Design a protein around this ligand. Structure first.
Ligand SMILES: Nc1nc2c(ncn2[C@@H]2O[C@H](COP(=O)(O)OP(=O)(O)OP(=O)(O)O)[C@@H](O)[C@H]2O)c(=O)[nH]1
Ligand SMILES: Nc1ncnc2c1ncn2[C@@H]1O[C@H](COP(=O)(O)OP(=O)(O)CP(=O)(O)O)[C@@H](O)[C@H]1O
Ligand SMILES: Nc1nc2c(ncn2[C@@H]2O[C@H](COP(=O)(O)OP(=O)(O)O)[C@@H](O)[C@H]2O)c(=O)[nH]1
Ligand SMILES: [Ca+2]
Ligand SMILES: [Mg+2]
Ligand SMILES: [Mg+2]
Ligand SMILES: [Mg+2]
Lengths: 54, 439, 423, 338
């Protein structure tokens, strides 16, 4: 059990005690995903308005 | 000095943010009107507290923070609250109608319309920074905005700030204070999308906080106010190293370095002690040994689980108050001989310790009694995977019948995303099992 | 400010709708003039959900009154709170609908519907952020049923992304006006399954039974029945009208209550059924789940709860409320579906209804509601197999095929409830 | 009104417990997937401990201690004893054992050979599949044609032999540990005896050496000649000790048995105790003992999911309800507390 890296200041202290040693999507791709979802909402709404028109 | 920008998303994120900045101002001696008589450098400076606060020529200390919500009622309380003068209007972003507890509504439908606005407000804060190191993001798992908009925001932040670290403070859903049946859906969906964009995430189970408030604060029916002031104390303990002079966890990158050996496994368990009622007239102050011992008790954890039946990858002890290294080591030596603390073979069995001499600050009129010493333990243990298992099981029950799924598809989300998100969680559980258990 | 636009159609619709506005105006401290004379600020915090602000701090109900004959709406305007409604929001014809769905939906109603939509549009344009619509009507008559569902379809066409909610009064032979009620109700349910997000099923059979068996009213009138309805409506809209966390708006309520699109028909409940003795929280909780307190004349034990919303009103221990609600679930867990975890949500509002210290309102999405639809379907088929009374409808241009389709769809709905009852 | 669920249909013990609960009229059995239970009669494998104690308004109890498998796995039991300072490497009541991994795959294959060179009859076994040999050559060659891990411990060459018959036996003791971690020893144990004379020159025969009921009714006759089903109970065995050895069962044997039970369970207590946990647990254990010529008691193994003697099913299962279950969930001693 040894203490290492003891650092001290007016506000406090810090150290390390060891007990035992060891043994992204592009900007364009984001907008495509958002626009694809929007188009699906649009298609679904288009089908509804078509159905109501009938 | 390197600045940190806090981002608060949805009701949970905003209300917790309001509690944290209230506590921060009390800790740094900052008045509600922004003035700070302790700060002798007027109009600027590069002190440790400047990581969270910028300064105007008038001497106002302004939080480096952005509040975002898709409905205005929660943030409107900040605009007219006690610390209304602290923030300027550009920092507070509100939409018209919320995500209705629907991840897809928050992510795709409403998120698309407001994501550019939020990023530009963040840019304005970033333009003030001489050396921005990253972001602290506060949000719920269960809310439509908290889950849906956050995951989108985290994606865009990785694009616009590729070299910047991102930390999460995440509210894990508990039915005792939950407002939606579909919160397991939202939790898995947002975890899946955010997993690669978060370097370190601190999960807080509302169940744990709720029970701590009942058990230790003698509150029969804890409100969000009670929960948030307790969460605020834990958050303060975690971020204290960024705001005060010190040599441990002094930058965001150090959190990953000290707590997260494997990227996907970036969910440290927080444990806090002591939690004592202010209404308790007679109280005996707990020693270093006693509050340190309390760090290995499930009743004091931010997430109920059993570390005895898991393995540790890292452990950090963060002390506030009358604590000296001698007493810490004597406490640890005793605990190691009386408790089950298994580290993985490819990691050293040890503790990183930080001590700040200033004892915890408590909100005047709050539920928490002032103590001479307190500690927050951050440990990366595989036992926290129990929380994923619980969540994934609830997901499986509903999804097998496709219950509520039409709400998500109706917002333009594909049903396949449910499966992809769940498969990712299955792999995550497997990763924990491989690291943690034997035969 | 998230506004709701209220619509009441036909005799039943306007009579129950009128009572509703009388009750909640009293709860919000609004006199029958539009003036606020309350003592609490909780009354005004969400007042804009149902009321517009006029000149001189007057509050005007966001309500549209519709009928194909002037009679009932003349009575409303002569009523106690009759002067509180916007004069321009009275939309009425003179012909009537003769208890005939076809007249309401296709001929007489078709002539009046555009003028209603003009008023609907005028109210919606004033809204800062419109939530959606609530309609009160009966399914057994002509105007509320036929023109009411016509209105719903037209509104959905103009506002496809807004929530549509109804309080729908289901007919019963026990309290019947005409023999064709099963026809009108079956045609209407078909419409409701497709075009509403939330429908509160108010069974006149249940209302009559409660008045007679429980309230000990020898000869219940429609007025006595409407007392139960207005009380129920006040309770189920509490979360919309007052500060709260759960089901605070129409869409969050729908997301919580509707796991499958077509299964959005709720059984409402209320306790205590209305002397001077206040009810303890265990009593409120026990009674609100009792079948005798249900408004749909369906036995909850004959089915399972998919979702449940419970609202408690008054000064009470929120801890005791939680314990009792957990007690009900944990000791009758067989009647709650296992594949929807934590499917019972509870809200508490400090403001109690008039004349009561404490109250509880129950909203259940139960598969037992199939009993209501099966009851209507049997009455429908008993006549339709002999094509009885059909000439009233074919005379308005309808074809028999439309009846067959409506019947098939309602039988499909019954089957779907049965599927999830066994699941 | 309490509620419970059943997830192990193959448990004779908790099938009877399930009966008694229902017979009280104050317990209801739910579907196995219903989360709203007070009591869980869990499955033997991969019990979802992580999902317990998270149902608000419900005190939840389970009939297994998480982590108890360390006592109840042969390879784990050996490791536990040699590693734990409470039990130490020099344990007197546990036979000299070694954990041996097959070469086709923390291994003590080398350590075993060292002590062997220094009667050398050893026994091979794992968690039927037992080899008893006096030569270490064919012992190691047996585990490489299996796959899983094995253990090699000294075969006690001088067992206490019952007379008449000159026959081997083993003692089964049932132990109930409740949610408060009280240790309860069932006052009734059983003697699983061999019906064949013990031959120290015939290890080829696996009958008079293995006292397993599986290998006494099967692959072995006679059977039931001396005692019914090769089972002797404590009343008769104590009478035998008094008549033949002028001693009692309590003095010569049970004192050691109680010591061993206490030692094992107190050792793992901090690892498995549910004292300050969000769910509570209890568990029934089956301890198997061996007695030598000098009336010394040896621990052979600990069983995590034991069956019971047919005669003793009624009394023990009722004791489980009263001590383990009703203590947590009260309604409207056969155990010796250690
Ligand atoms: N600890 C804590 N949890 C909260 C708070 N507010 C909400 N929650 C939890 O967060 C979940 C609800 O999500 P919210 O954050 O309210 O939702 P939102 O992010 O505003 O998203 P929408 O309202 O759906 O647009 C539930 O599990 C609540 O228990 C809070 O102030 N403190
Ligand atoms: N070291 C040793 N010395 C003498 N006999 C031994 C021994 N190890 C095992 N035995 C004998 O072998 C038999 C079976 O041993 P073991 O306990 O490994 O099998 P098992 O686990 O299948 C019994 P159960 O599962 O029913 O408790 C025992 O009855 C015992 O008599
Ligand atoms: N509860 C209740 N039911 C009513 C009332 N008036 C009519 N009904 C029922 O509504 C149906 C008749 O429809 P009605 O509304 O009179 O026809 P409309 O004017 O053409 O819509 C029958 O089932 C009646 O039992 C009322 O005031 N209260
Ligand atoms: Ca300065
Ligand atoms: Mg919100
Ligand atoms: Mg009429
Ligand atoms: Mg065995």
């Amino acid at each position: 059990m040894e203490v290492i890296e003891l650092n001290k200041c007016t506000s406090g202290q810090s150290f390390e005690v060891i007990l035992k040693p060891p043994s992204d999507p592009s900007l364009e791709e984001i907008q495509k995903k958002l626009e694809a979802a929007e188009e699906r909402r649009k298609y679904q709404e288009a089908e509804l308005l078509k159905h109501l028109a009938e | 000095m390197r600045e940190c920008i806090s981002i608060h998303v949805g009701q949970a994120g905003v209300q917790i943010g309001n509690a944290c900045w209230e506590l921060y101002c009390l800790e740094h001696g900052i008045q509600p009107d922004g003035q700070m008589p302790s700060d002798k450098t007027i109009g600027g400076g590069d002190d440790s507290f400047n990581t969270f606060f910028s300064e105007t020529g008038a001497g106002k200390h302004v939080p480096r923070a952005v509040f975002v919500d898709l409905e205005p009622t929660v943030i409107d309380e900040v605009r007219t609250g006690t610390y209304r003068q602290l923030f300027h209007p550009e920092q507070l972003i509100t939409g018209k109608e919320d995500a209705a507890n629907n991840y897809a509504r928050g992510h795709y439908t409403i998120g698309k319309e407001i994501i550019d606005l939020v990023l530009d407000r963040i840019r304005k804060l970033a333009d003030q920074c001489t050396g921005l190191q990253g972001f602290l993001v506060f949000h719920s798992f269960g809310g439509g905005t908290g889950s849906g908009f956050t995951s989108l925001l985290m994606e865009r932040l990785s694009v616009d700030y590729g070299k910047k670290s991102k930390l999460e403070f995440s509210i894990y859903p508990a039915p005792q204070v939950s407002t939606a049946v579909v919160e397991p859906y939202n939790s898995i969906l947002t975890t899946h999308t955010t997993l690669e964009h978060s370097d370190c995430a601190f999960m807080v189970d509302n169940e744990a906080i709720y029970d701590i408030c009942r058990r230790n604060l003698d509150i029969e029916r804890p409100t969000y106010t009670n929960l948030n002031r307790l969460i605020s104390q834990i958050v303060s303990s975690i971020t204290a190293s960024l705001r005060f002079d010190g040599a441990l966890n002094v930058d965001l990158t150090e959190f990953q370095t000290n707590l997260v050996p494997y990227p996907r496994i970036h969910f440290p368990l927080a444990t806090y002690a002591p939690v004592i009622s202010a209404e308790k007239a007679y109280h005996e102050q707990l020693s270093v040994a006693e509050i340190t011992n309390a760090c290995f008790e499930p009743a004091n954890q931010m997430v109920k689980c059993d570390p005895r039946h898991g393995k540790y990858m890292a452990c950090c002890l963060l002390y506030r108050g009358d604590v000296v290294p001698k007493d810490v080591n004597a406490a640890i030596a005793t605990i190691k001989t009386k408790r089950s603390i298994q580290f993985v073979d490819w990691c050293p069995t040890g503790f990183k310790v930080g001590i700040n001499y200033q004892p915890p600050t408590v909100v005047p009129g709050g539920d928490l009694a002032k103590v001479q010493r307190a500690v927050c333990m951050l440990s990366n243990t595989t036992a926290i995977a129990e929380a994923w298992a619980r969540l994934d099981h609830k997901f499986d029950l509903m999804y097998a019948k496709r219950a509520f799924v039409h709400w998500y598809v109706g917002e333009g989300m594909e049903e396949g995303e449910f499966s992809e998100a769940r498969e990712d969680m299955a792999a995550l559980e497997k990763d924990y099992e491989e690291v943690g258990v034997d035969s | 400010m998230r506004e709701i636009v209220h619509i009441q159609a036909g005799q039943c619709g306007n009579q129950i709708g009128a009572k509703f506005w009388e009750v909640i105006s009293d709860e919000h401290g609004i006199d029958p003039t539009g003036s606020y004379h309350g003592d609490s600020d909780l009354q005004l915090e969400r007042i804009n959900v149902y009321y517009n602000e006029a000149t001189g701090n007057k509050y005007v109900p966001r309500a549209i009154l519709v009928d194909l004959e002037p009679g009932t709406m003349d009575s409303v305007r002569s009523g106690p709170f009759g002067q509180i409604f916007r004069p321009d929001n009275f939309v009425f014809g003179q012909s009537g609908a003769g208890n005939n769905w076809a007249k309401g939906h296709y001929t007489e109603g078709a002539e009046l519907v555009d003028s209603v939509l003009d008023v609907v549009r005028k109210e919606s344009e004033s809204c800062d952020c419109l939530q959606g619509f609530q309609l009160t009507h009966s399914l057994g008559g002509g105007t509320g049923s036929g023109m009411g569902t016509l209105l719903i379809s037209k509104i959905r066409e103009e506002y496809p992304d807004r929530i549509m909610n109804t309080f729908s009064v289901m007919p019963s032979p026990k309290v019947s006006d005409t023999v064709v009620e099963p026809y009108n109700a079956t045609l209407s349910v078909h419409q409701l399954v497709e075009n509403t997000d939330e429908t509160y099923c108010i069974d006149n059979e249940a209302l009559y039974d409660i008045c007679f068996r429980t309230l000990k009213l020898t000869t219940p009138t429609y007025g006595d029945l409407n007392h139960l309805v207005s009380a129920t409506m006040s309770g189920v809209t509490t979360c919309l009208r007052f500060p709260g966390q759960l089901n605070a708006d129409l869409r969050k309520l729908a997301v919580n209550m509707v796991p499958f699109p077509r299964l959005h028909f709720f059984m409402p409940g209320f306790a205590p059924l209305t002397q001077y003795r206040a009810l303890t929280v265990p009593e409120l909780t026990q009674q609100m789940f009792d079948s005798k307190n249900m408004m749909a004349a369906c036995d909850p034990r004959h089915g399972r709860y998919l979702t449940v919303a419970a609202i408690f009103r008054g000064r009470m221990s929120m801890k005791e409320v939680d314990e009792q609600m957990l007690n009900v679930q944990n000791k009758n867990s067989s009647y709650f579906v296992e594949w929807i975890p934590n499917n019972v949500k509870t809200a508490v509002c400090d403001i109690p209804p008039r004349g009561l210290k404490m109250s509880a309102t129950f909203i259940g999405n139960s598969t037992a509601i199939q009993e209501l639809f099966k009851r209507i379907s049997e009455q429908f088929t008993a006549m339709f197999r002999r094509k009885a009374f059909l000439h009233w409808y074919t005379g308005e241009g309808m074809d028999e095929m439309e009846f067959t389709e409506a019947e098939s769809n309602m039988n499909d709905l019954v089957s779907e409830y049965q599927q999830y009852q066994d699941a | 009104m309490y509620t419970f669920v059943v997830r192990d249909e193959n448990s004779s013990v908790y099938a009877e417990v399930s009966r008694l609960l229902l017979a009280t009229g104050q317990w209801k059995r739910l579907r196995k997937d219903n989360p709203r239970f007070n009591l869980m009669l869990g499955e033997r494998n991969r019990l979802p401990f992580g999902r317990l104690g998270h149902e608000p308004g419900l005190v939840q109890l389970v009939n297994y201690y998480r982590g108890a498998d360390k006592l109840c796995r042969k390879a784990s039991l050996v490791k536990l004893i040699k590693t734990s300072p409470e039990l130490s490497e020099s344990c007197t009541w546990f036979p000299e054992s070694y954990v041996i991994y097959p070469t086709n795959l923390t291994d003590e294959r080398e350590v075993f050979l060292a002590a062997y060179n220094r009667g050398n009859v050893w026994i091979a076994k794992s968690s039927e599949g037992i080899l008893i040999s006096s030569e270490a050559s064919e012992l190691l060659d047996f585990i490489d044609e299996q796959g899983q891990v094995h253990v090699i411990q000294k075969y006690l060459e001088k067992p206490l032999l019952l007379e008449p018959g000159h026959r081997k036996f083993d003692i089964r003791s049932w132990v109930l540990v409740d949610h408060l971690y009280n240790i309860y020893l069932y006052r009734e144990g059983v003697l699983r005896t061999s019906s064949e004379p013990y031959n120290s020159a015939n290890f080829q025969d696996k009958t008079c050496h293995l006292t397993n009921h599986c290998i006494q009714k099967e692959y072995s006759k006679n059977y039931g000649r001396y005692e019914e089903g090769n089972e002797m109970f404590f009343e008769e065995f104590n009478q035998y000790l008094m008549d033949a050895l002028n001693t009692t069962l309590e003095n010569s044997i049970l004192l050691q048995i109680k010591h061993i039970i206490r030692s094992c369970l107190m050792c793992i207590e901090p690892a498995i105790s549910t004292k300050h946990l969000h769910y509570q647990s209890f568990q029934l254990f089956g301890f198997d003992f061996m007695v030598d010529e000098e009336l010394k008691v040896w621990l052979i193994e600990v069983n995590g999911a034991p069956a019971c003697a047919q005669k003793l099913y009624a009394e023990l299962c009722q004791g489980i309800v009263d001590v383990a279950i009703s203590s947590v969930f009260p309604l409207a001693s056969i155990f010796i507390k250690l």
